[PDB]
Design a protein around this ligand. Structure first.
Ligand SMILES: Nc1ncnc2c1ncn2[C@@H]1O[C@H](COP(=O)(O)NP(=O)(O)OP(=O)(O)O)[C@@H](O)[C@H]1O
Ligand SMILES: Nc1ncnc2c1ncn2[C@@H]1O[C@H](COP(=O)(O)NP(=O)(O)OP(=O)(O)O)[C@@H](O)[C@H]1O
Ligand SMILES: [Mg+2]
Ligand SMILES: [Mg+2]
Lengths: 296, 200, 632
């Protein structure tokens, strides 16, 4: 059962990708799934439903006017405006798939999206000041969403999984999401609702398939999925966030996954890839695939 | 597991300057919300100030601070109990300052008279006007049920120190004086009873 | 070695036109007496190549002839000689058709076409056959690589990586030219981070292209993973398409570009993905610059590539000989390394080991053996003085009079691809025109920039084909940006504009913050009308006419002359009145100017500037500039 979930960010969010300074307006589904796992382990909940049957998407912008989806990567027949274009409204998605959108219309769509304003917060660390030292400045990138806008996502699973995810989101509203939490970022309010429009759009039979999340398949599915398919690799990496993995903070094994919006003619499934490097527990990374049918 | 939500209002007692180019303008502008352009108090400026006050009182390496504000040291990986959130300009304060045609922030002129040439060096520091109220929102994480009372006693000590101290900017020169007003200490996550808990 | 004599003849097949307007002149020299060369000047391949390509003072001509008056791996020196000499001489001595093609351009294009045709033959009706291959090499994620920098050495990397990147591209092309038995003339030209080549359409060339693409993919995966990934896309071409017959030359350019884009879409192969997702050990220590853990990291938290980049950064301005050899500091494909050394070190590298390539930076001399001239603008005012060389950009910040700030410039040409594809009309469009335009752009950006910035406190971080990064004194940055704009305008004879962003920062402000803020400034400057400069605040965006004349010459200069009773306090009062921006404030300004003991002409000028809306912000900017320049 696909269930729309909208997040309204009271406070600015970090959502970092490679550094603390940079800020992304969205995060891949792997970050959301890791946050859900952390919250479930904090609440002593069961991880059987999350690991087995829970196919979620990335976080996607939504505005006061209409919801948005990642731009499918298909050939366009100036092109700089198309390449700069990143998100397409749900109503214009079919038009873009047919190619009816032109360069001027693509630029107007790019200007139409109003998520929020990104900015840089210059903070310091004064811990060395009293120890005969000096303050250390650093920067945190924060993207403050517009009052109307927010970040939505879709999650497909059984009713028990939907209820467990409802509880997890109720806890995440205060636990926070993204990066630099406990320092004034990541606080949000959730709203889980049924969406008829997304149900209609997902329930289609197109000739191509578009990825709505950062996904990667096993060896055989990868063998029979890359044929004449346009994609983009994202380097999912970082450190491990837990108090029961190692005595120090160590990085996890580097992972690579296709970006959301990549078009694959053959539909491949995904698995929760394990990126634990000889640790006490297994640091998971979400790589399941949420597919959207499309016509070109 | 539980999360206790402390909702309240910070009342500005002196022009609060949390800091955060063009000539003849505000040299040190306050941090503001990007779209709202409403001055805010970053949660970091509250969390670090409370940590410093607890270091002054309890004493850093102290297990109480190391458990409350969080740590990442070797072996002792502890999640931060206190998640402060940014304090936004309160709507009631917005209405009050919209009345009286009052600007949300003032531009306090200052200078510095050198000990050698006796030449002042003027600055224009932006400060949030006295009487402005910021809606503040703290979350306490109940990792250990037995330690909740001790942690809240430490938090009350930190708040008591802070109300006699400054929150941001140069407080030793008068800026930053604030006063907490706790509106709720209700629990939002879990079943832990927070009715008996008090901050002020 | 019929191919070598064919190359020499094709390059020199029009050498007699110079002496005619000032074969036998070639016969005057024994080394050039060889039968193939003189036959081409006066074989059939040279004639067919000239046909494919085609489809002022007599005393100075005599002087050129006097100056002009053949072994393997010596063709590069002759090509450099031709480029250095026949640039100003038109290919067509006198014709009703415009002489856009120069002698060097025609000679180089004819030599490339002749080499391709000979390779095709080895493996009017001839024109219709698919005989050529238009190939394009495009590195991906270039600026991402350049701006991914660790702070403590960021500036160094900022200067080196781009340089490294450009040199890397050169090496790649040369390796391809080494694997195709072709010369440097066979490449059409190389834009900033993008190279375009013309190759024979033989099975050997296609197999070499496939092997080169695979091997470069493997090398970039090994070294830079996904940060850098060059893509090579080729399209078959007929002779009539090269001659703009049937109007398909622009069609060939466009189809090659979109084939390259499609190849960029599907970048990595199956086994490459499998190897990407097969990391055995995560790795604890990570580099400061590239934030990579798989590669071994030194005790200084710097990757090996990063350390070599810093070494080449400190080396690049000192010496002028890039040696690609097994010995070096930074990696290069086919297990090579890049070093910067003096001429003695260069010749030592040449003699010790063969297959060592040498690139001389901005050196027009052709007598040196086995050197290919690379153009690069490395103008650094700090290097001119040894103490300033030690200090760095803090020397630029140092200033006797004026606010000690640092200015950053991020200029970029507007709609250059539109000019290349659509700007040149259908009748005149030919590959020689495109080659001439690209060479002129590269010569302006890589060589003329050092002349323009001469005598100014500016350090060129990079001066690529379109983009331009400068950092120095804020006033010097602005003045040289205006001089650059006027010089570019007179060089292009119109029809070309660039948008710029100038940002002012403190000395110790982080370099990444400077770069990001100036980039967003120039992004606002591009806007939709283009040809704009975003100065200081991102809110204010002006035009070149406004900034050069209206803001500085029209308003700032009279204020400077009047201020030099008048003091900075009067200027600050006027600034407060102007920035308040209310009608009662213009009334107060009129009052103040009436009692300011100012000249009535300037007083009325200031009042009129305050009355308007655009002149208001122009006067605000002028007074701000004067205040910045007059600080103590
Ligand atoms: N070595 C260099 N240093 C500085 N700038 C360069 C250099 N090489 C190329 N450039 C320019 O710098 C920009 C880098 O942009 P990119 O990082 O995107 N690499 P690009 O060649 O454009 O391929 P795409 O990812 O766009 O498909 C280009 O737009 C070029 O105009
Ligand atoms: N020196 C050069 N010679 C020939 N072609 C070049 C040269 N430098 C860059 N190019 C090409 O010129 C283009 C410059 O790219 P740009 O980054 O300048 N963006 P552009 O296409 O000009 O449109 P705008 O965004 O400015 O409105 C590159 O994409 C290349 O296709
Ligand atoms: Mg440009
Ligand atoms: Mg550019």
């Amino acid at each position: 059962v696909v269930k729309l979930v909208k997040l309204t960010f009271k406070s600015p969010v970090h959502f970092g990708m490679k550094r603390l300074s940079d800020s992304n307006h969205t995060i891949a589904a792997d970050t959301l799934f890791s946050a859900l796992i952390i919250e479930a382990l904090q609440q002593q909940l069961e991880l059987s439903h999350l690991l087995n049957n829970l196919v979620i998407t990335d976080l996607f912008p939504y505005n006061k006017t209409s919801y948005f989806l990642p731009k499918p990567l298909i050939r366009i027949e100036g092109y700089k405006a198309f390449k700069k274009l990143t998100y397409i409204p749900v109503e214009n998605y079919s038009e873009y798939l047919r190619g009816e959108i032109d360069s001027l219309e693509a630029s107007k769509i790019a200007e139409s999206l109003n998520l929020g304003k990104a900015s840089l917060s210059t903070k310091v660390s004064l811990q060395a000041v009293d120890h005969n030292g000096e303050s250390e400045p650093y920067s945190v990138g924060n993207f403050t969403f517009y009052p109307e806008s927010g970040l939505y996502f879709l999650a497909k699973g059984n009713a028990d999984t939907i209820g467990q995810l409802e509880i997890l989101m109720h806890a995440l509203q205060y636990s926070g999401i993204g990066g630099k939490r406990s320092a004034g970022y990541g606080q949000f309010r959730c709203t889980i609702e049924d969406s008829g429009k997304f149900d209609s759009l997902l329930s289609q039979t197109g000739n191509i398939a578009i990825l709505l999340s950062s996904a990667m398949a096993s060896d055989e599915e990868l063998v029979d999925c890359l044929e004449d398919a346009r994609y983009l690799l994202k380097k999912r990496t970082g450190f491990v966030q837990s108090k029961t993995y190692a005595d120090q903070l160590v990085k996890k094994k580097d992972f690579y996954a296709f970006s959301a919006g990549s078009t694959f003619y053959q539909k491949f499934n995904g698995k929760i890839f394990d990126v634990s490097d000889n640790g006490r527990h297994s640091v998971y990374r979400y790589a399941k695939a949420f597919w959207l049918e499309g016509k070109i | 597991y539980s999360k206790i939500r402390i909702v309240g209002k910070i009342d500005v007692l002196t022009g609060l300057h949390i800091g955060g180019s063009m000539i003849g303008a505000i040299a040190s502008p306050v941090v503001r919300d990007p779209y709202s352009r409403l001055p805010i108090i970053p949660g970091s400026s509250i969390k670090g100030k409370m940590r410093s006050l607890l270091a002054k009182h309890i004493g850093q390496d102290a297990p109480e601070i190391l458990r409350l504000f969080g740590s990442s040291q070797k072996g002792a990986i502890q999640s931060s109990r206190l998640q402060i959130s940014d304090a936004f300009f309160s709507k009631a304060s917005q209405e009050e300052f919209d009345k009286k045609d009052l600007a949300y922030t003032e531009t306090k002129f200052e200078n510095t008279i050198s000990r050698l040439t006796a030449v002042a060096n003027p600055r224009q520091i932006e400060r949030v006007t006295r009487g402005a109220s910021f809606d503040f929102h703290i979350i306490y994480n109940v990792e250990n049920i037995n330690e909740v009372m001790a942690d809240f006693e430490n938090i009350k000590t930190a708040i008591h120190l802070l109300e006699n101290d400054y929150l941001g900017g140069g407080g030793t020169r008068g800026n930053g004086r604030i006063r907490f007003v706790i509106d709720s200490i209700d629990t939002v996550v879990g079943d832990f009873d927070s009715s008996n808990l008090s901050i002020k | 070695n019929k191919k070598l004599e064919l190359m020499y003849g094709s390059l020199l097949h029009d050498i007699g036109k110079i002496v005619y307007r000032s074969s036998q002149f070639l016969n005057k020299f024994k080394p050039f007496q060889l039968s193939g060369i003189v036959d081409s000047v006066s074989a059939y391949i040279t004639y067919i190549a000239d046909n494919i390509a085609s489809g002022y003072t007599s005393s100075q001509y005599a002087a050129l002839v006097n100056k002009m008056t053949v072994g393997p791996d010596s063709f590069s020196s002759l090509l450099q000689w031709t480029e250095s000499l026949w640039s100003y001489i038109p290919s067509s001595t006198d014709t009703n058709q415009v002489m856009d093609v120069s002698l060097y351009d025609h000679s180089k294009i004819t030599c490339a076409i002749a080499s391709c045709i000979y390779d095709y033959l080895t493996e009017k009706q001839f024109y219709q056959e698919d005989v050529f291959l238009l190939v394009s090499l495009d590195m991906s994620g270039i600026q991402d690589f350049i701006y991914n920098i660790s702070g403590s050495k960021a500036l160094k990397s900022l200067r080196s990586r781009s340089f490294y990147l450009e040199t890397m591209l050169e090496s790649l092309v040369d390796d391809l030219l080494s694997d195709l038995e072709l010369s440097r003339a066979n490449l059409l030209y190389t834009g900033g981070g993008h190279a375009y080549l013309l190759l024979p359409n033989t099975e050997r060339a296609r197999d070499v292209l496939a092997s080169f693409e695979g091997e470069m993919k493997e090398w970039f995966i090994k070294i830079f993973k996904t940060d850098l990934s060059v893509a090579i896309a080729y399209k078959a071409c007929t002779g009539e398409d090269l001659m703009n017959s049937n109007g398909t030359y622009s069609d060939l350019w466009q189809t090659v570009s979109r084939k390259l884009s499609d190849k960029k879409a599907h970048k990595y192969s199956l086994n490459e993905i499998k190897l990407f997702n097969s990391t055995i050990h995560a790795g604890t220590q990570e580099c400061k610059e590239c934030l990579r853990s798989d590669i071994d990291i030194s005790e200084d938290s710097l990757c090996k590539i990063c350390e070599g980049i810093i070494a080449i950064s400190n080396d690049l301005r000192d010496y002028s000989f890039f040696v690609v050899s097994p010995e070096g500091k930074v990696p290069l494909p086919r297990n090579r390394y890049l070093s910067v050394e003096n001429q003695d070190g260069a010749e030592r590298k040449i003699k010790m080991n063969k297959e060592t390539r040498i690139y001389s930076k901005n050196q027009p001399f052709v007598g040196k053996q086995l050197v290919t001239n690379l153009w690069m603008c490395d103008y650094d005012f700090s290097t001119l003085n040894p103490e300033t060389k030690k200090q760095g950009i803090a020397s630029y910040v140092n200033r006797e009079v004026g606010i000690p700030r640092l200015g950053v410039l991020r200029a970029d040409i507007d709609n250059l691809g539109t000019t290349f594809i659509k700007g040149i009309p259908e009748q005149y469009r030919s590959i020689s025109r495109t080659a001439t335009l690209s060479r002129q752009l590269s010569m302006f950006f890589k060589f003329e920039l050092s002349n323009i910035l001469k005598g100014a406190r500016i350090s060129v971080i990079y001066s690529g084909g379109d983009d331009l990064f400068l950092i120095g004194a804020w006033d010097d940055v602005i003045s040289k940006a205006l001089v650059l704009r006027k010089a570019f305008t007179r060089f292009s004879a119109g029809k070309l504009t660039f948008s710029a962003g100038i940002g002012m920062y403190p000395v110790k402000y982080p370099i990444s913050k400077m770069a990001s803020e100036t980039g967003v400034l120039e992004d606002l400057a591009k806007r939709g009308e283009k040809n704009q400069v975003a100065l200081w605040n991102d809110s204010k965006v002006f035009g070149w006419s406004q900034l050069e004349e209206q803001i500085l010459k029209e308003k700032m200069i009279p204020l400077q002359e009047a201020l030099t009773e008048h003091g900075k306090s009067f200027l600050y009062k006027m600034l407060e009145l102007l920035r308040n921006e209310d009608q009662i404030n213009i009334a107060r300004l009129a009052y103040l100017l009436a009692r300011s003991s100012l000249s009535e002409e300037l007083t009325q000028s200031i009042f009129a500037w305050s009355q308007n809306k655009q002149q208001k912000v122009e006067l605000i900017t002028a007074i701000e500039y004067l205040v910045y320049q007059i600080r103590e």
